[PDB]
Design a protein around this ligand. Structure first.
Ligand code: GCE
Ligand code: ADP
Ligand code: MG
Length: 328
C-alpha cells in the first residue's frame, strides 16, 4: 500500500525571460512543501492557487540536492531488489532534461564524475558502482535506452548504424502488466569508467534522430533502463526506469494524451483503465498502479507568460498523488 510520491522543481528565470522583464508568479516554499501560483494578473492582485506536495525545490536548488534527497532512497530500494521509476513531467523548457541528465560545465573545468551540473542518470550510474564495489556482493549492471516518437520505437544504443530501424512491442506472458521490446539491445556496463563512453554513443544517435524527425527533442519520450543482478546463495534483481517525457503543452501526441486519461481513470476509480491506447502507457503500466515504486518530478517556469501551462502541470501532478501501487 504505497502512494506515488510527487515533487515539484521550479527553475530560475532564463535569459529570454530576463530581457523581456518577466514577473514571477510562483512562490516555492520548501519547508512547508507548498507551491503557490499568482493567478489574477493585473485584474485581481490577491488570488492564488496553492498545492501541497511531497517536496518542493525552489530555483536555487543544486543538482546534488535533487540526487541526495530523491535518488538515494530509491536507489537503496533498487539495491534491495525492487522495481522503481522516476519520470520528469512538465512543459518544454522547464528543466525535464536538465533534471534527468544535466549538462557539462563549459571550458572543460571538471571531470564528468565531479561536474556540479550533472543530473540523475550520470550520478546514478557512477554511484551504483561506488556503492556495490568494495561492498561485498557479486553484481552485473546492464542498461538500455529506447525512445518513443510518433508511436514508433527507436533504439538509441543499438549497434545498428541507422537510428531509424524500428523496434516492436508485445505483451509479456511472464508478467501480467509488462511488455517485451522485441529487438532492444541491453549493454553491459562493467565498471564506472565505461559509463561515459556509452552515454557518448547514445548522445550521438540522438543528434542524428533530431536531423530526421521534426521537433524530435520535445515530442519524444525517453526511457533509460538500468538492471542490477546481485548474488548474496541468495540472488535479488533490481530494475530502475529513468523517463524524460515530451513537453506537456500538447497521431503524434498519442502517448502524452493517453497518459492523462490513464491518470484521471485511476484516481477516479473508473473500471477500465486505457493502458493499451499508447506505447508509453503500455511500458509504464506497472508504474501507474502496478507493483513498482514510482516518483514524479514535475518541472515548471516562474514566468507570468506561462501561467496556463504552469497551472496545468501542477493540477496533473497534484492529482497523481492519489494513486496507489503495491511494490514487490
Ligand atoms: C557530451 O558528452 N555527453 C555524452 C554528456 O555530456 N552526457 N550524456 C548524458 C546522457 C546521454 C544519453 F544518451 C542518455 C542519457 C544521458 F543522461 S548525460 C550528459 C549530458 C547530456 C546532455 N543533457 C552529462 C554527463 C555527465 C555530466 C554532465 C552531463
Ligand atoms: N533547474 C535549473 N537550474 C538552472 N537552469 C536550468 C534548470 N532547469 C533548466 N535550466 C535551463 O533551461 C534550459 C531548458 O531546460 P531543459 O531540461 O532542456 O528543458 P526541457 O524541460 O524541455 O527538457 C536548459 O538550457 C537549462 O540550462
Ligand atoms: Mg527536452
Amino acid at each position: 500500500g504505497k502512494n506515488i510520491q510527487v515533487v515539484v522543481r521550479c527553475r530560475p528565470f532564463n535569459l529570454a525571460e530576463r530581457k523581456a522583464s518577466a514577473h514571477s508568479i510562483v512562490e516555492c516554499d520548501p519547508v512547508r512543501k507548498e507551491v503557490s501560483v499568482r493567478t489574477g494578473g493585473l485584474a485581481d492582485k490577491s488570488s492564488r492557487k496553492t498545492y501541497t506536495f511531497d517536496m518542493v525545490f525552489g530555483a536555487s536548488t543544486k543538482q546534488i540536492d535533487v540526487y541526495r534527497s530523491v535518488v538515494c532512497p530509491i536507489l537503496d530500494e533498487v539495491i534491495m531488489g525492487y522495481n522503481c521509476t522516476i519520470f520528469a513531467y512538465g512543459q518544454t523548457g522547464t528543466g525535464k532534461t536538465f533534471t534527468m541528465e544535466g549538462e557539462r560545465s563549459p571550458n572543460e573545468e571538471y571531470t564528468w564524475e565531479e561536474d556540479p551540473l550533472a543530473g540523475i542518470i550520470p550520478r546514478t550510474l557512477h554511484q551504483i558502482f561506488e556503492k556495490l564495489t568494495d561492498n561485498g556482493t557479486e553484481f552485473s549492471v546492464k542498461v538500455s535506452l529506447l525512445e518513443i516518437y510518433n508511436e514508433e520505437l527507436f533504439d538509441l544504443l543499438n549497434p545498428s548504424s541507422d537510428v531509424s530501424e524500428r523496434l516492436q512491442m508485445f505483451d509479456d506472458p511472464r508478467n501480467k502488466r509488462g511488455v517485451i521490446i522485441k529487438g532492444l539491445e541491453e549493454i553491459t556496463v562493467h565498471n564506472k569508467d565505461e559509463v561515459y563512453q556509452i552515454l557518448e554513443k547514445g548522445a550521438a544517435k540522438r543528434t542524428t534522430a533530431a536531423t530526421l524527425m521534426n521537433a524530435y527533442s520535445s515530442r519524444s519520450h525517453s526511457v533509460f533502463s538500468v538492471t542490477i543482478h546481485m548474488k548474496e546463495e541468495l540472488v535479488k534483481i533490481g530494475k530502475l526506469n529513468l523517463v524524460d517525457l515530451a513537453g506537456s503543452e500538447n497521431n503524434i501526441n498519442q502517448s502524452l494524451l493517453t497518459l492523462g486519461r490513464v491518470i484521471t481513470a485511476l484516481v477516479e476509480r473508473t473500471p477500465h483503465v486505457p493502458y493499451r491506447e499508447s506505447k508509453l502507457t503500455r511500458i509504464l503500466q506497472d508504474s501507474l498502479g502496478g507493483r513498482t515504486r514510482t516518483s514524479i518530478i514535475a518541472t515548471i517556469s516562474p514566468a507570468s507568460l506561462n501561467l496556463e501551462e504552469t497551472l496545468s502541470t501542477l493540477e496533473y501532478a497534484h492529482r497523481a498523488k492519489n494513486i496507489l501501487n503495491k511494490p514487490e
